[PDB]
Design a protein around this ligand. Structure first.
Ligand SMILES: O=C(O)CCc1ccccc1
Ligand SMILES: O=C(O)CCc1ccccc1
Lengths: 396, 396
């Protein structure tokens, strides 16, 4: 049965982990997959997380299956983060949240739900895009088309091209937006631009799907959700696939959420029953530990305070590395001005390095980035900055 | 987009949790979903598990993403449990294991892998069947057909009917077997019958898919794997979807495995790359906590000893409840002899109660079973036995 199966192509992002592990050279620098490193060059467990895990160890008395949609408190805390405490969406019971195994799990659940229960055939994603969107949506039998987004000459959101390319999107198409810290460009709509897009979306009949994996990494928790909230104010229906991987440092525990919004409570409940069916046919019910940690932290004033400060500290360290990166490139004699990198939001810098420069960086220098030119600034430290910048200067 | 969506039908098993929660009557008895309860009528966390969780709390320094196939030690320990230490399958590197979110996740991954990468169109399941098999395989676009299995008059495996119904299975069809503790009948093939089936399977060209969620609950860890090992000795290719939900009491942490076996290392590696692709397009990578607990326990002599005794204790308590159930029914004046229940393996008794008797049990008596007549013996205790048996006698 398996004799003729062809090997799967390496994933542009995920395939980096294997390569890095097989590289026996010391002093290699991992700027590939988007994880937060601290100044010591390690990926720590957050203190608030360890505290929550200790509480769970001391207090859990069962591992009895969660509901298909997960921990109820987790859903409530999620909707507050997404929509704001006292949001009309919450007051009107227009939203239902399934806890999922990561934002990745939420994207698959959304895609399966849409494919099986609606007339959706096409999802629009930005160019450039995060590769897993195409993979996941295609897997569910959905076409993926690209809309213009980034002006690489100005290093800006090409709003004109964006709007013009989305004219090709039909009513009933899905349009995917990143809530903040667009991956990979780090370029987000302004509030006005979000508001313009929200209006356009309503007029054109698009179903908005927000991928919201970086809440807190652009400006802050509430500010980062402005765009999503602009959309929520204008739309009867939307979906959010959100993640706690990055903002809680909980990557491997697979903690995210698929949130479904409809016009009213009756509609969302009916629709959400089919979203639960799509989960039942997949992994049945979500993993408790990571989501319990999130709910524990978000529902305790003291833990929440510690956690929110940890998140601020992460954002601020990345901002320091961003500036030091730009400064060190210039002092190492870079043949390009890289000041545009300061404008970018989140963990990455979309550097303009070619695919061949990225390959040479890895082969010659043991510096690992994504072939798109995306580099993980959250993987930079005072100690590795000089070597990594010397390497970049050498390949320019 | 969501206006016309029809509500999803209630799941025969999973829908019980909601109903039970909405039932405000005290002294209701939950014999529905298959969880292990102790004598106090609660679903405890295993001591070995708590010990492992304390070790993880003290020693984990990162939540960095696992590989797509999960923790390497988890896979190794899994293959040892499935195939035996020093198995030729392990020596010859013919098996690859992906850690998954439950056996349920493993079933979906297997189905997606098969649908996308082979000519499989049909999966054969026993009658009666575990409902999630049809749901999951249908979701992946695979037809599901039933083979005869249980003789309800004799309360036995109708081996003749089994073999005769499977004549309709074509070469290249999948045939699903339960490794032990057939759900719901509790009736398993003898070793000779497994060996006969293994030979027949090879002759007929079926791809065997084992659902192995109850290793240790029939007779013991090694004995329960005899059937699977009989098949492994005879086949070039098979798949195992196994679970640690029940044997570790880790239900809500979603700990299972999809194990792929091919003729040789080259073939399995090539095929497994597409199994990883099917994961990438789903939840990306599996949840660490539950699987780390399993690996920690299985790889430490002292924890393993404690854990294996806990598993024995669970099996033995269920066996005591099985006998007490039969004894109490007879002394409560049951109008049927229920001695056939002693022969059944695992957590359940497939009682012969009609769908209407089950409904009346719930409505009138607050006793919750599955409409198929399946009752969770592992949910019985000395304290709830009298009331539950009085209820059953009343509806006969
Ligand atoms: O590196 C990234 O783009 C974020 C981390 C990640 C990558 C692929 C799947 C899930 C998360
Ligand atoms: O009750 C059962 O049959 C076992 C528990 C279960 C039920 C449905 C999906 C996964 C596990």
């Amino acid at each position: 049965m398996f004799e003729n199966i062809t090997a799967a192509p390496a994933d542009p992002i995920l395939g980096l982990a294997d390569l890095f592990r097989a590289d026996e050279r010391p002093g290699k620098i991992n700027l590939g997959i988007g994880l937060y490193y601290d100044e010591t060059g390690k990926i720590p467990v957050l203190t608030s997380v360890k505290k929550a895990e200790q509480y769970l160890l001391e207090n859990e008395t069962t591992k009895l299956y969660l509901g298909i949609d997960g921990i109820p408190e987790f859903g409530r805390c999620t909707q507050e983060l997404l929509f704001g405490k006292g949001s009309a969406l919450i007051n009107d019971k227009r939203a239902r949240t399934a806890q999922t195994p990561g934002g990745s799990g939420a994207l698959r659940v959304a895609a399966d739900f849409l494919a099986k229960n609606t007339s959706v055939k096409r999802v629009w994603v930005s160019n450039p895009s995060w590769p897993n969107h195409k993979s996941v949506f295609n897997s569910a039998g959905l076409e993926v088309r690209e809309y213009a987004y980034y002006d690489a000459e100005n290093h800006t959101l090409d709003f004109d091209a964006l709007i013009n390319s989305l004219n090709e999107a039909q009513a009933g198409d899905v349009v995917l937006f990143h809530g903040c810290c667009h991956n990979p460009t780090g370029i987000d709509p302004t509030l006005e631009q979000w508001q313009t897009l929200a209006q356009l979306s309503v007029e054109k009949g698009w179903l908005p799907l927000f991928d919201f994996a970086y809440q807190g990494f652009a400006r802050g928790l509430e500010e980062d959700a402005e765009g999503l909230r602009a959309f929520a104010a204008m739309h009867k229906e939307l979906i959010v696939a959100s993640s706690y991987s990055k903002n809680f440092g909980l990557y491997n525990e697979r903690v995210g959420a698929c949130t479904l919004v409809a016009a009213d409570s009756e509609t969302v409940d009916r629709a959400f029953s089919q979203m639960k069916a799509a989960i039942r046919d997949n992994y049945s019910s979500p993993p408790a530990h990571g989501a319990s940690v999130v709910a524990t932290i978000l529902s305790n004033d003291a833990l929440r305070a510690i956690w929110e400060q940890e998140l601020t500290d992460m954002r601020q360290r990345i901002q320091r590395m961003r500036q030091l990166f730009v400064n060190t490139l210039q002092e190492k004699g870079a043949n390009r001005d890289f000041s545009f990198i300061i404008k970018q939001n989140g963990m990455f810098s979309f550097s303009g390095l070619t695919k061949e420069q990225v390959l040479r960086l890895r082969e010659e220098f043991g510096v690992y980035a994504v072939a798109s030119g995306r580099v993980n600034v959250a993987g930079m430290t005072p100690d590795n900055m000089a070597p990594l910048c010397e390497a970049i200067v050498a390949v320019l």
